[PDB]
Design a protein around this ligand. Structure first.
Ligand SMILES: CCOc1ccc2nc(S(N)(=O)=O)sc2c1
Ligand SMILES: [Zn+2]
Ligand SMILES: [Zn+2]
Ligand SMILES: [Zn+2]
Lengths: 160, 159, 158
């Protein structure tokens, strides 16, 4: 009950016109969307990587391949749920997740509760163990120019 | 045994005509950080880590850029109120770690003072607070000195 | 026992011609390598900073002109870092990390990096993790101008 481990996750996707904007499982109206072979859900990908990392199971690319017919059409919530199943099977219980989305636009505050609810459901966690934060990049860099969106995640687990 | 972790990120532009305040320390420099508050990028990152570890949202939720209450605000006062709310939520802080990334000025002479400020504001001994500082090895807008970034991690426990 | 602490680390180095690419102690075939005073192993630097941070010992810049470390490679420095963490009364519980590089492919080398780090930190493999991804062609990382590493470390004061 004291074998705690920490994991950390990072992801980024390009933001361009012509695709939907989906973050934390939430479709957000915007003139641009994230590019990636999946649904490009940068927040769920970062959290997934933090969870695999806390369990020392490698990373999201080692677990899911575009070539794998099991996951070919899978959205990022299905990937997060499978991640959590593998983390549990390796012997770990998740204690909490925290995260940050960095986007110059749109405003993400109205969507935070919905994202937290999706993530908590997918991880079978109480809502008060899941946190999502959001901020701009103060107009600096490709993030500040609206050319991508970044997500960071931290996860604490314990080996039971 | 109810431990929780949080992580924080912040960045502010470096501009002429502003005080440079990082970790609560007013640093002599021809430029300063631009923000609604005093724009203390390090304290904001730590504030976000603490709110995040307690699942209390983020700094924008508690101390909005849009609220005139916080124009020019002392970010140490914001950090102390953050810590008060984290305590009110049932959490004790176990440690904080952080990094400042900047091309200039030299931060080594100021790091110990930043650590002491953060420790005081969080009611922690110095040995549970850590401030790291580095350059971005000449890359990107940080390499060009256009802003300063801070990162933070916080461990809390629900008592 | 229960005095846990967390640390976090970040580093980035430029990719330059005429130098070997060494990440996680692994020499990787590539026409460029990382620039730095050391061998510029950006992954070991990030982990080193996370460990110093978790133990509240400052940072890599304060720890490392010293004739003990003049020509030291990054694994010797990681080992010395781990010594100083132990000196302060801390035991390492786990390390996690991410390498961000547009090229070359790091997947074939990850297992060796983890084994190198585990040996240097005197940890079992199941307490060390290395992740790797691209930057989706964004920014200086996406243009192949540098490689970034991030790390998180958990320690306990015994
Ligand atoms: C079936 C889906 O398989 C994959 C494979 C790689 C992969 N990488 C990411 S990332 N680098 O976090 O944008 S999400 C993803 C999904
Ligand atoms: Zn992704
Ligand atoms: Zn700020
Ligand atoms: Zn370095």
């Amino acid at each position: 009950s004291m074998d705690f481990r920490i994991g950390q996750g990072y992801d980024v996707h390009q933001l361009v016109p012509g695709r939907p904007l989906i973050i934390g499982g939430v479709t957000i109206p915007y003139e641009r969307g994230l590019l990636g072979h999946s649904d490009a859900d940068v927040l769920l990908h970062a959290i997934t990587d933090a969870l695999f990392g806390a369990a020392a199971l490698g990373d999201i690319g080692r677990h899911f391949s575009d070539t794998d017919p099991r996951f070919k059409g899978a959205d990022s919530r299905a990937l997060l749920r499978e991640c959590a199943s593998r983390v549990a099977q390796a012997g770990f219980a998740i204690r909490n997740v925290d995260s940050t989305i960095i986007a110059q636009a749109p405003k993400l505050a109205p969507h935070i509760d919905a994202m937290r609810a999706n993530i908590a459901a997918d991880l079978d966690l109480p809502l008060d163990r899941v946190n999502v934060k959001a901020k701009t990049n103060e107009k600096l860099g490709y993030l500040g120019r609206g050319e991508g969106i970044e997500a960071q995640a931290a996860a604490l687990v314990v080996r039971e």
